[PDB]
Design a binder for this molecule. Structure first.
Ligand code: CLA
Ligand code: CLA
Ligand code: CLA
Ligand code: CLA
Ligand code: CLA
Ligand code: CLA
Ligand code: CLA
Ligand code: CLA
Ligand code: CLA
Ligand SMILES: CC1=C(C/C=C(\C)CCC[C@H](C)CCC[C@H](C)CCCC(C)C)C(=O)c2ccccc2C1=O
Ligand code: SF4
Ligand code: SF4
Lengths: 30, 80, 34, 147, 171, 223, 73, 130, 72, 162
């Protein structure tokens, strides 16, 4: 069983990967 | 609007012009055939792409060619 | 908040809210003018 | 009725719903886009490749995380021939009590895993739900690298 | 006698003057509806439409929802009310985006005359053209229409829930 | 009646023949409209007035078809998804939300009461399907009251929906056989032609024959 | 037969004409090309063949199913 | 009965023009007939000509041209088709130079003419990124 | 989407367009893009996509459920 | 008692008491409106009387087949809805009455299409008026007979209380 801290930081890191994805998405232009 | 091109294999038999349902083609003077006439496409903005023009073409591989392109309310045949 | 509450927090969130905002954005974008 | 097919002015002038339909289906045909050069083509393909590899790694990380969180990997280690691997838990508001009871596996309704990831990860030397979590973390980091 | 004639003496319109399109009953009935009733601001039209729509929308959700009850249940009423309110929210979102993408006007019935008189040599579709002269056909008008629809929907849904509870309890 | 293969075969064969003949009647109505219809000889008569408002007919028939299909088939799908979700009390069943065909049951009651009340010189109902006793010959049932419940409601509305869609296809073929907003001179192309071309976004199957083709498909479905 | 119908219902005339072109090339290479030039079925005839085969296959499947079921029991 | 006296005696059909031919463009065909012949509308059913000036409005150029092609069967040739924009912006369309397009008229220049057959078209690979 | 082609769906859409344009309480709402039938190539693609998705889904369901329900 | 529609063969321009000889056009329009409304309501009432007598499927049977007895058996919340519906209908009729070219009993707006009325249109309007008058007499007789005798129409006829 994984802890709340383990899932929480994985969610936070996933958010960072999301901001990197929109930056790539917006850089590939409208 | 679609693109219509005429090629010098035209024999001036007028069958394309009298088959156009939207008055796109017309016969113009020429000196490359016996009839002294060649088809022209001066009103391609009304071209609908039905390709009746090249169904009436007797030349071997056509003298009028319709290339479908960008669509318009006129070219889509929209009464609405 | 336990870990077993995360499905009930996220599945409605994603599967309903994300469609709504995505539809809003996509409709606005594809209905734009110049 | 404008500006959606930014890559095609011919479609953007279409007054019909065909513009929306063709805007989707021609988005990845970069060679047919307006104001197109070869350098831009290769660069866009390169960036799209990077985004695609990032998507693949994120998908693998999600599989790892959901096996680590809602699966029964650790229990399956001790009895691989009797315990059925679990892919992920289910939370669907439309379930009746009967559906909840039938899909109930251990603590929550869940889907059996038919991808064979349990056997693959067990073979390559994974024995803990913390080993899977490390893999998910590393794969999300790799996805961030690729993006 | 003939009871079907070309509409407004135009035989080329895609319409007909049947005993249903242009009957006195149709005229009066459509002129008493909030969408066409004279003397109503767009906010008032939206408010009345929202009230009626929430009022009849709470019905199917409460009666046939996932949490029905052959007897009266507060949970069933709350579920139906919440479903109706969220559906009204979705409809209001649709109204808002439709008005955002449709009109670019703040005062109609004038701009048409201005461009028919003082010329409209511009990018058109805002100065010229302009379909419809109603106050509902403006950015401001449609925004207030959506606001009224949303508020009236909430109020009508609450009123219908209260009425349903009273009918189920005291009858 | 006790030869079940004969009864089943006779019913199915005759219904198939009926559906085929109905599609053929629609086809030949379209053929008449294309070929033998004279506009001058039919000024302001019933045929002319039907063509003049073909849009209204076809649009309302379209709405009716969508309504009937949505309802019948989606009630079927709702039953299927409620059963798949373990919610047996949310179905459109007899032990659940019930849709009793009350109008048909009223007619069934009227027929079983007809002998002696409305048909006073009758000794027995016309058919035991409307009600009465179980008629058996050699321990095999010949006829018996056919009970109508929520299952018959759904299938009857499925029948109505399929019939309406077939009528929609065939009537659209007949009415739009001469002209349309797409092809204003469709009558000059004849009854049987593949298209007018890839233009107008595509003018496949605009004939009237291509409507007897789709209507044949939908008649197969309905029958 | 019902599955056979879908070849005519789903496909188009141009592909079959261009395949007949290569078949005719082979026949001409072997000097066995018929004088009556082989052409793919017209669009309307392709639709007619498709619908006829579809109806025959479906009705025959239901025919065999009904007859076997109601004769056995 | 009708807005204008020159309209054909048509009872109106739900196949005429729509909101498009009020804000985008509408097409009008005019012709003079010797007899009040009964003809079929391109949109709906049968209409009656006027023994004189006849004017009809349609939503498409193709509808007007189909009506004109029908008129040729009545030995009517002087029919002329115009395009009307949202305001009264009339443009003569079909008899553009007064002579039907099927008959050669001096003063017409070839449009869209290529001085080669189909086989002379350039290879598509040489028409990449232009 | 594969058997029925275009042309039959454009006229029906035109009838629907007339119905929407000529009905009260719905004239207030009008489309920005003119509704037209799917193009021939688009229709072929959509029919192929439905065919393939249905094929894959039904066979996946069959193989998985049959194996599970037959072999315990 | 004018060129108004409704004059039939047995008694043409039937105004024996001279109610219309002194009234203006507005009063005559009011009289025609009242007559047409009474006739329509009476036709509905007669049809309902008979049909209710030999068929009352609603309310799970019950609701005794004798009229003027089921009048006091309807849940009284269905009475309110019928009353409100009639009221809304007559509000709509009032709104119609101010439309230009309005005719006394014409709520369909037939004046829009019917200019220079024919003899068939006048004959059909007279048919409606005469049927309405006959139904008014019939419903008055029905109510009076049910009050004095206590039996309904087909019940009194069946027994022979004539
Ligand atoms: C592509 C990989 C992937 C996929 C298909 C899924 C699928 C699912 N997840 Mg999930 N998840 C993933 C990765 C993934 N996960 C990762 C990496 C994390 C760690 C942060 C989580 C954490 C997580 C939680 C905490 C929960 C789920 C839940 C769920 C289920 C409901 C959907 C939901 O609420 O999402 C919510 C998902 C997140 C909040 C995390 C974001 C998911 C990844 C990072 C984004 C991937 C995007 C993808 C590549 C393309 C996006 C397309 C988009 C532009 C439209 C569903 C089975 C719920 C569940 O189990 O219900 C029973 C739930 O409560 N997920
Ligand atoms: C991931 C996708 C997803 C999710 C999470 C849900 C979730 C839900 N669906 Mg649903 N649905 C979906 C996709 C989804 N749907 C799709 C794609 C379809 C079409 C195939 C349907 C078709 C469908 C039907 C036909 C029905 C549902 C119903 C429900 C509810 C379950 C019944 C119950 O016990 O709640 C009981 C519900 C309540 C007690 C009230 C819920 C009302 C909303 C959802 C609450 C939202 C709150 C929101 C934040 C308010 C915003 C602020 C506002 C006040 C201004 C639940 C909310 C049922 C339902 O409840 O209907 C409303 C129902 O009848 N769904
Ligand atoms: C699925 C169809 C459906 C269902 C199940 C209901 C169910 C209901 N409607 Mg309803 N309604 C519907 C469609 C439906 N409606 C439609 C389409 C309209 C528009 C004509 C209306 C207009 C309407 C009004 C105007 C009223 C109801 C009322 C009611 C309630 C009557 C019982 C009660 O307590 O009030 C008694 C009940 C919850 C009543 C209500 O809620 O009163 C508080 C009420 O006054 N309905
Ligand atoms: C199973 C396959 C299938 C289905 C579903 C349909 C469905 C339909 N056909 Mg048909 N058709 C088929 C095969 C099928 N066809 C084939 C093989 C052919 C070849 C010959 C045709 C040829 C054909 C013609 C020629 C015509 C139709 C027409 C129709 C429509 C009738 C109106 C109706 O019921 O709409 C209601 C829709 C349904 C019943 C489909 C299911 C909808 C569900 C049950 C309810 C709604 C679900 C909900 C919205 C989901 C939301 C959630 C989602 C967003 C995730 C309907 C869309 C007619 C038409 O245009 O319509 C009038 C018509 O003229 N069809
Ligand atoms: C047409 C087909 C159909 C119908 C009638 C229903 C009906 C229903 N479904 Mg359902 N369903 C269907 C298809 C259908 N389903 C399909 C295809 C699926 C699979 C995708 C589902 C999946 C599904 C789920 C998962 C659930 C339901 C549920 C329900 C119930 C509540 C739905 C609700 O909130 O109503 C909302 C209704 C409205 C907002 C009103 C719409 C209807 C109005 C009354 C029309 C009025 C027209 C009017 C008369 C016009 C004239 C007006 C006049 C003034 C002129 C209800 C019995 C829920 C349940 O449990 O119930 C038992 C639930 O949880 N459905
Ligand atoms: C590879 C899989 C496969 C395929 C492609 C087929 C193909 C076919 N089978 Mg089939 N079959 C298979 C496997 C398969 N079979 C197996 C494994 C079995 C078990 C022995 C059968 C048993 C079987 C029987 C017993 C029957 C078929 C029939 C058919 C034909 C249907 C033709 C058609 O257009 O249907 C069109 C589809 C329909 C008209 C509806 C299908 C029936 C549904 C389930 C009933 C639902 C109706 C319901 C009231 C709602 C309907 C709404 C809507 C129809 C309006 C077709 C040739 C039937 C036939 O002859 O035609 C139907 C038939 O009688 N097959
Ligand atoms: C003045 C007219 C009138 C009035 C006051 C009543 C009153 C009554 N009828 Mg009734 N009825 C009428 C006419 C009328 N009827 C007509 C003309 C018929 C023949 C179709 C019937 C057939 C009928 C049956 C079969 C039953 C009743 C029953 C009843 C009782 C319960 C209410 C009910 O369910 O109505 C039901 C009414 C109908 C089903 C039909 C009403 C149709 C209306 C009158 C026509 C349309 C009215 C419209 C909204 C307004 C006109 C528009 C325009 C002209 C302005 C109640 C005493 C029930 C009872 O308990 O019987 C003892 C019962 O079962 N009625
Ligand atoms: C707008 C839609 C609508 C709705 C939702 C209702 C709803 C209702 N009506 Mg109703 N009604 C309506 C329009 C409507 N009415 C119209 C237009 C008329 C014609 C005037 C009537 C005439 C009417 C009568 C005569 C009766 C009802 C009754 C009822 C109630 C019982 C219905 C039921 O099946 O039990 C759930 C219920 C509250 C009955 C009632 O309230 O008795 C308890 C009753 O006797 N209604
Ligand atoms: C259509 C006209 C008409 C017809 C044919 C009858 C027929 C009859 N009436 Mg009568 N009646 C009518 C109108 C009519 N009534 C009117 C308008 C009134 C009100 C003044 C009455 C008042 C009335 C009374 C008071 C009595 C009859 C009685 C009778 C019966 C002798 C016979 C069945 C008698 C009867 O049947 O009761 C014994 C009786 O006593 N009628
Ligand atoms: C295969 C095919 C062809 C080619 C088909 C041809 C050329 C038909 C050839 C028929 C042969 C030559 C005669 C029939 C031979 C059969 C063995 C006889 C029938 C069997 C009897 C028992 C009836 C098309 O022309 C076509 C056109 C439009 C859409 C789809 C298609 C299509 O799918
Ligand atoms: S498509 Fe061929 S026929 Fe139709 S208009 Fe353009 S050219 Fe004339
Ligand atoms: S697509 Fe339309 S046009 Fe092209 S061939 Fe098939 S039918 Fe004729």
């Amino acid at each position: 069983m994984i802890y709340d801290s383990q899932v929480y930081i994985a969610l936070v890191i996933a958010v960072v990967a999301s901001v990197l994805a929109i930056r790539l998405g917006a850089t590939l232009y409208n | 609007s679609h693109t219509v091109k005429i090629y010098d294999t035209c024999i001036g038999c007028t069958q394309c012009v009298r088959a156009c349902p939207t008055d796109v083609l017309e016969m113009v003077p020429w000196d490359g055939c016996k009839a002294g006439q060649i088809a022209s496409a001066p009103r391609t903005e009304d071209c609908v792409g039905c390709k009746r023009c090249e169904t009436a073409c007797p030349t071997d591989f056509l003298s009028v060619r319709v290339y479908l392109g960008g669509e318009t309310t006129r070219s889509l045949g929209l009464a609405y | 908040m336990s870990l077993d509450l995360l499905p009930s927090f996220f599945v409605p969130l994603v599967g309903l809210v994300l469609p709504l905002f995505s539809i809003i954005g996509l409709f606005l974008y594809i209905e734009k003018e110049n | 009725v404008y500006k959606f097919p930014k890559f095609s002015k011919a479609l953007a002038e279409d007054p019909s719903t065909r513009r929306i339909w063709y805007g989707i289906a021609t988005a990845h045909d970069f060679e047919s886009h307006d104001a197109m050069t070869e350098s831009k083509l290769y660069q866009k393909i390169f960036a799209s490749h990077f985004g695609h590899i990032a998507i693949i790694f994120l998908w693998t990380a999600g599989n790892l995380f959901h096996v680590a969180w809602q699966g029964n990997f650790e229990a399956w280690i001790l009895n691989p021939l009797k315990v059925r691997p679990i892919a992920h838990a289910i939370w669907d508001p439309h379930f009746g009590q009967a559906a909840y009871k039938a899909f109930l596996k251990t603590s929550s309704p869940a889907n059996l895993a038919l991808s064979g990831v349990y056997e693959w990860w067990y073979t390559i030397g994974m024995r803990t739900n913390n080993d899977l979590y490390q893999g998910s973390f590393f794969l999300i980091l790799l996805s961030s690298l690729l993006l | 006698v003939s009871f079907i004639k070309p509409y407004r003496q135009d035989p080329f319109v895609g319409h007909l003057a049947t005993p249903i399109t242009t009957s006195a009953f149709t005229r009066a009935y459509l002129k008493v509806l909030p969408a066409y009733r004279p003397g109503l601001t767009p906010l008032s039209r939206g408010a009345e439409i929202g009230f009626t729509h929430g009022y009849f929308l709470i019905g199917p959700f409460y009666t046939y929802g996932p949490l029905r009850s052959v007897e009266f249940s507060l949970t069933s009423l709350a579920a139906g009310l919440l479903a109706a309110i969220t559906l009204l929210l979705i409809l209001t979102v649709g109204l808002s985006i439709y008005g955002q993408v449709t009109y670019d006007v703040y005062d109609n019935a004038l701009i048409v005359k201005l461009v028919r008189q003082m010329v409209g040599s511009e990018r058109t579709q805002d100065l010229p053209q302009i379909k419809g002269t109603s106050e509902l056909d403006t950015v401001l008008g449609w925004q207030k229409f959506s606001e009224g629809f949303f508020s009236g929907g909430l109020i009508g849904s609450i009123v219908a829930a209260v009425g349903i509870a009273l009918y189920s309890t005291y009858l | 009646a006790i030869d079940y293969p004969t009864q089943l075969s006779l019913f199915t064969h005759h219904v198939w023949i009926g559906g085929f003949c109905i599609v053929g009647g629609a086809a030949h109505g379209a053929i008449f409209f294309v070929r033998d219809y004279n506009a001058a000889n039919n000024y302001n008569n019933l045929i002319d007035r039907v063509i003049r408002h073909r849009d209204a007919i076809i649009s309302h028939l379209n709405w009716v078809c969508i309504f009937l299909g949505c309802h019948s088939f989606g009630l079927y799908v709702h039953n299927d998804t409620m059963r798949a979700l373990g919610r047996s009390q949310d179905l459109f069943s007899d032990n659940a939300i019930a849709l009793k065909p009350i109008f048909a049951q009223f007619i069934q009651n009227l027929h079983t009461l007809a002998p002696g009340s409305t048909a006073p010189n009758a000794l027995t109902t016309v058919s035991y399907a409307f009600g009465g006793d179980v008629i058996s010959v050699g321990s095999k049932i010949a006829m018996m009251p056919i009970s109508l419940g929520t299952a018959d409601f759904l299938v009857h509305h499925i029948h109505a929906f399929t019939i309406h869609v077939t009528v929609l296809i065939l009537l659209k073929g007949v009415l739009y056989s001469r002209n349309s907003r797409l092809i204003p001179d469709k009558a000059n192309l004849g009854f049987r032609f593949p298209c007018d071309g890839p233009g107008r976004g595509g003018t496949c199957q605009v004939s009237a024959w291509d409507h007897v083709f789709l209507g044949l498909f939908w008649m197969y479905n309905s029958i | 037969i019902w599955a056979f119908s879908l070849m005519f219902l789903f496909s188009g005339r141009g592909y079959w004409q261009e395949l007949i072109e290569s078949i005719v090339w082979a026949h001409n290479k072997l000097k066995v090309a018929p004088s009556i030039q082989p052409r793919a079925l017209s669009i309307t005839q392709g639709r007619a063949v498709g619908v006829a085969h579809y109806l025959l296959g479906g009705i025959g499947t239901t025919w065999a199913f009904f007859l076997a079921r109601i004769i056995s029991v | 009965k009708l807005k204008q006296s020159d309209f054909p005696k048509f009872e109106g059909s739900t196949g005429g023009w729509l909101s498009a031919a009020k804000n985008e463009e509408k097409y009008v065909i005019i012709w003079t007939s010797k007899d009040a012949s009964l003809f079929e509308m391109p949109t709906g059913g049968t209409a009656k000509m006027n023994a004189g000036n006849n004017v009809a409005y349609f939503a498409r150029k193709e509808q007007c041209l189909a009506l004109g092609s029908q008129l040729r069967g009545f030995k009517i040739t002087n029919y002329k088709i115009f395009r009307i924009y949202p305001p009264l912006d009339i443009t003569l369309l079909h008899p553009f130079d007064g002579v039907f397009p099927e008959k050669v008229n001096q003063g017409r220049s070839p449009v869209g003419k290529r001085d080669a057959s189909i086989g002379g078209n350039p290879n598509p690979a040489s028409l990449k990124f232009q | 989407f594969l058997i029925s082609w275009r042309g039959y769906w454009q006229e029906l859409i035109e009838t629907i367009v007339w119905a929407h344009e000529r009905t009260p309480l719905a004239n207030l709402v009008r489309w920005k893009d003119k509704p037209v039938a799917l193009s021939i190539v688009q229709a072929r693609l959509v029919g192929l996509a439905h065919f393939t998705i249905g094929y894959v889904l039904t066979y996946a369901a069959f193989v998985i459920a049959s194996t599970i329900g037959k072999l315990g | 008692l004018d060129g108004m529609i409704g004059s039939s063969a047995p008694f043409k321009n039937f105004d024996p008491l001279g109610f219309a000889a002194k009234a203006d056009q507005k009063t005559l329009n009011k009289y025609r409106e009242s007559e047409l409304k009474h006739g329509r309501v009476a036709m509905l009432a007669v049809l309902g009387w008979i049909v209710q007598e030999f068929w009352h499927p609603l309310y799970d049977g019950k609701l005794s087949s004798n009229p003027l007895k089921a009048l006091t058996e309807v849940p009284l919340i269905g009475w309110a809805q019928i009353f409100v519906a009639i009221n809304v209908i007559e509000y709509l009729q009032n709104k119609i009455k101010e439309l230009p070219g309005y005719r006394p009993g014409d709520y369909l707006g037939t004046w829009e299409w019917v200019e220079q009325s024919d003899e068939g249109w006048d004959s059909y309007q007279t048919k409606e008026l005469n049927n309405g008058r006959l139904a008014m007499v019939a419903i008055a007789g029905l109510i009076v007979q049910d009050l004095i005798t206590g039996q309904a129409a087909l019940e009194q006829i069946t027994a022979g209380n004539t």
